[PDB]
Design a protein around this ligand. Structure first.
Ligand SMILES: [Ca+2]
Ligand SMILES: [Ca+2]
Ligand SMILES: [Zn+2]
Length: 307
């Protein structure tokens, strides 16, 4: 799996010192800014922006609805492959109690189905430029990011599957908040290409938009990096493909080993099947009713997801 949302803290400390300070401040303050976390279902209004240069990139409404179905399964532990979670880890599995619905009202109060379509001359979008998120750069401007989760679907090229913007970046980069997914790996079955054809590229990206990090700590295989989640076993490097349970490494050398079936690893879509309770706590904390950075999204979520 390829992803543009790695946080190699050793590298960031040297290459991006202001970003290092911002991430460290966010983590020092995350416990003090998560007391009024909601006890009820969190609803996320979604807008999907299809940005296409050709017919293959202009994916079907059914393809998009299947992706929303997958998010609602994975974030509510309603994925049928939950049964595949090894019994040693199933007791750590979390139910995020987060729902996703396509928007029915656009930012001007007009009816919408929550899908936009933008033809473009851009052949390939760049994560570096964030050009898919700007109408003037060949993409499509975000819908009010305080109220909608914006998911852009486009051609990210031969390598990149998707990328997300993290919550610590919301204050300074509000208009680029959201997630971008490669069109070939959006939705389940249908036009999606194996082995990333079960909609988990977006489950993984939405996990980053909800403050989660790669489970192995983005540290080049060492045991020094962390995902800041105590119930995800310390893990060396990423896993790819479809490992066999149990898989141990130099960070967790005893069975049950590393949680390679966590959505925040780099494994194939069909071999992923859980978030942990600790990851759920972190994601839900962003909706703390008094100080949660994404709390406003809950104020008008019902209004925006009904006709
Ligand atoms: Ca961990
Ligand atoms: Ca590691
Ligand atoms: Zn990632």
């Amino acid at each position: 799996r390829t992803c543009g949302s790695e946080l190699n803290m050793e590298q960031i400390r040297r290459t991006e010192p202001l970003k290092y300070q911002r991430i460290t401040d966010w983590e020092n303050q995350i416990k003090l800014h998560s007391r009024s976390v909601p006890s009820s279902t969190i609803l996320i209004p979604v807008v999907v922006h299809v940005v296409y240069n050709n017919s293959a990139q202009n994916i079907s409404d059914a393809q998009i609805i299947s992706q929303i179905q997958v998010l609602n399964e994975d974030f509510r532990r309603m994925n049928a492959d939950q049964a595949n979670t090894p019994s040693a880890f199933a007791n750590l599995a979390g139910n995020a109690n987060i729902e996703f619905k396509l928007a029915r009202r656009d930012p001007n109060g007009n009816t919408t189905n929550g899908i936009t379509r933008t033809s473009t001359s851009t052949e390939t979008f760049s994560m570096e430029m964030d050009n898919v998120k700007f109408s003037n750069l060949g993409g499509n401007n975000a819908w009010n990011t305080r109220r909608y989760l914006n998911i852009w679907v486009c051609n990210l090229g031969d390598d990149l599957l998707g990328y997300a913007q993290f919550p610590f970046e919301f204050q300074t980069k509000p208009n680029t908040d959201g997630v971008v997914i490669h069109y070939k790996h959006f939705g389940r079955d249908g036009s999606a290409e194996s082995p990333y054809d079960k909609g988990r590229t977006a489950t993984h990206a939405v996990g980053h938009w909800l403050d989660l990090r790669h489970i192995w700590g983005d540290d080049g295989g060492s045991c020094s990096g962390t995902d800041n989640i105590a119930d995800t076993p310390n893990q060396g490097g990423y896993n790819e493909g479809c490992p066999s349970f149990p898989k141990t490494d130099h960070c967790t050398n005893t069975s049950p080993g590393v949680m390679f079936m966590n959505y925040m690893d780099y494994t194939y879509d069909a071999c992923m099947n859980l978030f942990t309770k600790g990851q759920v706590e972190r994601m839900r904390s962003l909706f703390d009713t008094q100080t949660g950075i994404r709390r406003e999204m809950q104020i008008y979520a019902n209004e925006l997801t009904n006709p």
